[PDB]
Design a protein around this motif. Sequence first.
Motif, PDB file in Angstrom:
ATOM      1  N   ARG A  45       0.879  -1.149   0.000  1.00 42.75           N
ATOM      2  CA  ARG A  45       0.000   0.000   0.000  1.00 42.75           C
ATOM      3  C   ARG A  45       0.943   1.233   0.000  1.00 42.75           C
ATOM      4  NH1 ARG A  45      -5.899   0.588   2.275  1.00 42.75           N
ATOM      5  NH2 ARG A  45      -5.567   2.567   3.665  1.00 42.75           N
ATOM      6  N   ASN A  46       0.470   2.278  -0.617  1.00 40.41           N
ATOM      7  CA  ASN A  46       1.154   3.563  -0.837  1.00 40.41           C
ATOM      8  C   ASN A  46       0.619   4.767  -0.076  1.00 40.41           C
ATOM      9  OD1 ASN A  46       2.738   2.572  -2.852  1.00 40.41           O
ATOM     10  ND2 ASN A  46       0.886   1.816  -3.980  1.00 40.41           N
ATOM     11  N   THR A  47       1.113   5.928  -0.428  1.00 42.30           N
ATOM     12  CA  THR A  47       0.717   7.209   0.169  1.00 42.30           C
ATOM     13  C   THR A  47      -0.519   7.824  -0.522  1.00 42.30           C
ATOM     14  OG1 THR A  47       2.992   8.129  -0.538  1.00 42.30           O
ATOM     15  CG2 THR A  47       1.943   9.118   1.525  1.00 42.30           C
ATOM     16  N   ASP A  48      -1.088   7.080  -1.451  1.00 41.18           N
ATOM     17  CA  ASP A  48      -2.216   7.619  -2.192  1.00 41.18           C
ATOM     18  C   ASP A  48      -3.472   6.814  -2.045  1.00 41.18           C
ATOM     19  OD1 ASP A  48      -0.782   5.668  -3.876  1.00 41.18           O
ATOM     20  OD2 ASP A  48      -0.199   7.157  -5.271  1.00 41.18           O
ATOM     21  N   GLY A  49      -3.423   5.703  -1.340  1.00 40.16           N
ATOM     22  CA  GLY A  49      -4.538   4.764  -1.142  1.00 40.16           C
ATOM     23  C   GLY A  49      -4.291   3.604  -2.095  1.00 40.16           C
ATOM     24  N   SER A  50      -3.258   3.896  -2.886  1.00 41.27           N
ATOM     25  CA  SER A  50      -2.849   2.969  -3.941  1.00 41.27           C
ATOM     26  C   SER A  50      -2.185   1.777  -3.377  1.00 41.27           C
ATOM     27  CB  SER A  50      -2.433   3.743  -5.190  1.00 41.27           C
ATOM     28  OG  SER A  50      -3.317   2.809  -6.003  1.00 41.27           O
ATOM     29  N   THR A  51      -2.194   0.654  -4.112  1.00 42.03           N
ATOM     30  CA  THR A  51      -1.624  -0.558  -3.681  1.00 42.03           C
ATOM     31  C   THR A  51      -1.079  -1.172  -4.983  1.00 42.03           C
ATOM     32  OG1 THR A  51      -3.357  -0.861  -2.060  1.00 42.03           O
ATOM     33  CG2 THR A  51      -1.948  -2.878  -2.417  1.00 42.03           C
ATOM     34  N   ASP A  52       0.097  -1.696  -4.920  1.00 42.54           N
ATOM     35  CA  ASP A  52       0.780  -2.347  -6.063  1.00 42.54           C
ATOM     36  C   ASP A  52       0.467  -3.826  -5.877  1.00 42.54           C
ATOM     37  OD1 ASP A  52       2.290   0.248  -6.811  1.00 42.54           O
ATOM     38  OD2 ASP A  52       3.817  -0.436  -5.322  1.00 42.54           O
ATOM     39  N   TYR A  53       0.247  -4.656  -6.903  1.00 43.29           N
ATOM     40  CA  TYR A  53      -0.114  -6.036  -6.720  1.00 43.29           C
ATOM     41  C   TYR A  53       0.613  -7.066  -7.452  1.00 43.29           C
ATOM     42  CZ  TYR A  53      -4.283  -4.276  -4.719  1.00 43.29           C
ATOM     43  OH  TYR A  53      -5.141  -3.550  -3.949  1.00 43.29           O
ATOM     44  N   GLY A  54       0.774  -8.170  -6.820  1.00 44.08           N
ATOM     45  CA  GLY A  54       1.435  -9.381  -7.355  1.00 44.08           C
ATOM     46  C   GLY A  54       2.971  -9.199  -7.471  1.00 44.08           C
ATOM     47  N   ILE A  55       3.475  -9.967  -8.374  1.00 38.50           N
ATOM     48  CA  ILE A  55       4.804 -10.244  -8.855  1.00 38.50           C
ATOM     49  C   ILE A  55       5.578  -9.167  -9.609  1.00 38.50           C
ATOM     50  CG2 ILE A  55       4.860 -11.562 -11.080  1.00 38.50           C
ATOM     51  CD1 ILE A  55       6.436 -13.586 -10.074  1.00 38.50           C
ATOM     52  N   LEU A  56       5.081  -8.112 -10.169  1.00 43.76           N
ATOM     53  CA  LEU A  56       5.762  -7.053 -10.886  1.00 43.76           C
ATOM     54  C   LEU A  56       5.154  -5.699 -10.536  1.00 43.76           C
ATOM     55  CD1 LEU A  56       5.876  -8.973 -14.233  1.00 43.76           C
ATOM     56  CD2 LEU A  56       7.711  -7.590 -13.037  1.00 43.76           C
ATOM     57  N   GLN A  57       4.528  -5.913  -9.430  1.00 44.63           N
ATOM     58  CA  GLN A  57       3.783  -5.010  -8.537  1.00 44.63           C
ATOM     59  C   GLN A  57       3.058  -3.957  -9.295  1.00 44.63           C
ATOM     60  OE1 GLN A  57       4.366  -4.087  -4.594  1.00 44.63           O
ATOM     61  NE2 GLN A  57       3.516  -6.225  -5.163  1.00 44.63           N
ATOM     62  N   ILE A  58       2.042  -4.422 -10.031  1.00 41.28           N
ATOM     63  CA  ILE A  58       1.189  -3.434 -10.793  1.00 41.28           C
ATOM     64  C   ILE A  58       0.259  -2.638  -9.844  1.00 41.28           C
ATOM     65  CG2 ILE A  58      -0.264  -3.437 -12.947  1.00 41.28           C
ATOM     66  CD1 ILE A  58       1.118  -5.698 -14.086  1.00 41.28           C
ATOM     67  N   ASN A  59       0.209  -1.335  -9.865  1.00 42.71           N
ATOM     68  CA  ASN A  59      -0.401  -0.195  -9.278  1.00 42.71           C
ATOM     69  C   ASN A  59      -1.906  -0.267  -9.688  1.00 42.71           C
ATOM     70  OD1 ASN A  59      -0.838   3.428  -9.056  1.00 42.71           O
ATOM     71  ND2 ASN A  59       0.136   2.211  -7.467  1.00 42.71           N
ATOM     72  N   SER A  60      -2.662  -0.023  -8.655  1.00 50.70           N
ATOM     73  CA  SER A  60      -4.121  -0.020  -8.559  1.00 50.70           C
ATOM     74  C   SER A  60      -4.768   1.246  -9.058  1.00 50.70           C
ATOM     75  CB  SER A  60      -4.140   0.277  -7.035  1.00 50.70           C
ATOM     76  OG  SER A  60      -5.280   0.355  -6.269  1.00 50.70           O
ATOM     77  N   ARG A  61      -3.913   2.252  -9.118  1.00 49.90           N
ATOM     78  CA  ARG A  61      -4.265   3.583  -9.508  1.00 49.90           C
ATOM     79  C   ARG A  61      -4.093   3.775 -10.991  1.00 49.90           C
ATOM     80  NH1 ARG A  61      -4.612   9.446  -8.229  1.00 49.90           N
ATOM     81  NH2 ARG A  61      -5.055   8.994  -6.086  1.00 49.90           N
ATOM     82  N   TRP A  62      -3.711   2.827 -11.798  1.00 47.46           N
ATOM     83  CA  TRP A  62      -3.566   3.164 -13.232  1.00 47.46           C
ATOM     84  C   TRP A  62      -3.978   1.969 -14.070  1.00 47.46           C
ATOM     85  CZ3 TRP A  62       0.488   6.270 -11.227  1.00 47.46           C
ATOM     86  CH2 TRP A  62       0.482   7.628 -11.649  1.00 47.46           C
ATOM     87  N   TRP A  63      -3.718   0.807 -13.490  1.00 49.34           N
ATOM     88  CA  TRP A  63      -3.936  -0.449 -14.229  1.00 49.34           C
ATOM     89  C   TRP A  63      -4.904  -1.442 -13.707  1.00 49.34           C
ATOM     90  CZ3 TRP A  63      -0.731   1.294 -18.094  1.00 49.34           C
ATOM     91  CH2 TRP A  63       0.325   2.136 -17.744  1.00 49.34           C
ATOM     92  N   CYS A  64      -5.443  -1.238 -12.536  1.00 49.45           N
ATOM     93  CA  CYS A  64      -6.466  -2.165 -11.905  1.00 49.45           C
ATOM     94  C   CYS A  64      -7.543  -1.680 -10.903  1.00 49.45           C
ATOM     95  CB  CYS A  64      -5.726  -3.447 -11.444  1.00 49.45           C
ATOM     96  SG  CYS A  64      -4.855  -3.366  -9.887  1.00 49.45           S
ATOM     97  N   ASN A  65      -8.617  -2.491 -10.740  1.00 48.25           N
ATOM     98  CA  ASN A  65      -9.637  -2.166  -9.739  1.00 48.25           C
ATOM     99  C   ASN A  65      -9.515  -3.129  -8.552  1.00 48.25           C
ATOM    100  OD1 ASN A  65     -11.114  -0.784  -7.793  1.00 48.25           O
ATOM    101  ND2 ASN A  65     -12.682  -2.405  -8.133  1.00 48.25           N
ATOM    102  N   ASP A  66      -9.083  -2.727  -7.371  1.00 45.81           N
ATOM    103  CA  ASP A  66      -8.846  -3.472  -6.107  1.00 45.81           C
ATOM    104  C   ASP A  66     -10.060  -3.279  -5.135  1.00 45.81           C
ATOM    105  OD1 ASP A  66      -7.897  -0.806  -5.605  1.00 45.81           O
ATOM    106  OD2 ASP A  66      -6.536  -1.032  -4.176  1.00 45.81           O
ATOM    107  N   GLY A  67     -10.892  -2.277  -5.389  1.00 43.25           N
ATOM    108  CA  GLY A  67     -12.095  -1.857  -4.735  1.00 43.25           C
ATOM    109  C   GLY A  67     -12.296  -0.436  -4.291  1.00 43.25           C
ATOM    110  N   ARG A  68     -11.201   0.194  -3.947  1.00 43.33           N
ATOM    111  CA  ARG A  68     -11.140   1.577  -3.386  1.00 43.33           C
ATOM    112  C   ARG A  68      -9.964   2.465  -3.637  1.00 43.33           C
ATOM    113  NH1 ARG A  68      -9.091  -3.633  -0.801  1.00 43.33           N
ATOM    114  NH2 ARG A  68      -6.914  -2.937  -0.654  1.00 43.33           N
ATOM    115  N   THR A  69      -9.870   3.279  -4.654  1.00 39.71           N
ATOM    116  CA  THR A  69      -8.699   4.181  -4.940  1.00 39.71           C
ATOM    117  C   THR A  69      -9.428   5.485  -5.253  1.00 39.71           C
ATOM    118  OG1 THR A  69      -7.228   2.231  -5.627  1.00 39.71           O
ATOM    119  CG2 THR A  69      -6.437   4.375  -6.354  1.00 39.71           C
ATOM    120  N   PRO A  70      -9.409   6.503  -4.420  1.00 37.61           N
ATOM    121  CA  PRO A  70     -10.151   7.738  -4.536  1.00 37.61           C
ATOM    122  C   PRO A  70     -10.048   8.555  -5.787  1.00 37.61           C
ATOM    123  CG  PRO A  70      -8.810   7.898  -2.602  1.00 37.61           C
ATOM    124  CD  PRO A  70      -8.741   6.463  -3.101  1.00 37.61           C
TER     125      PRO A  70
END
Length: 129
Positions: A45-70
Amino acid sequence: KVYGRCELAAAMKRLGLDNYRGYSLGNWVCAAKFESNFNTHATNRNTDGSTDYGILQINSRWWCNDGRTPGSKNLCNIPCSALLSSDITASVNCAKKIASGGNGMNAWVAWRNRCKGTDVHAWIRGCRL
């Protein structure tokens, strides 16, 4: 799932990453190492509500829906929990698009950082490929 180096190197060779955007497989290897330590469930998890995911740590704020990124995108149609599985298929599909853009693998910092100007080669040297 914590991956073998060569188990992970066999995988994204089959998955198609070798020489993809003229980046040779150890770039991939080395970014996963340095990005997740080969763990698929690794999360940050990051300073933006963002969270990077998996193995090449893809960001929730540009490339995916994790449930909650403002507020943001989904440049891949993936729910962020697909990043998170066993199977690298999805990480690697999404990964290709991130590296499809201008900066290429420079989107991964750690690669930028622990990997540009190295012997990435070295990440596949002793491999069952």
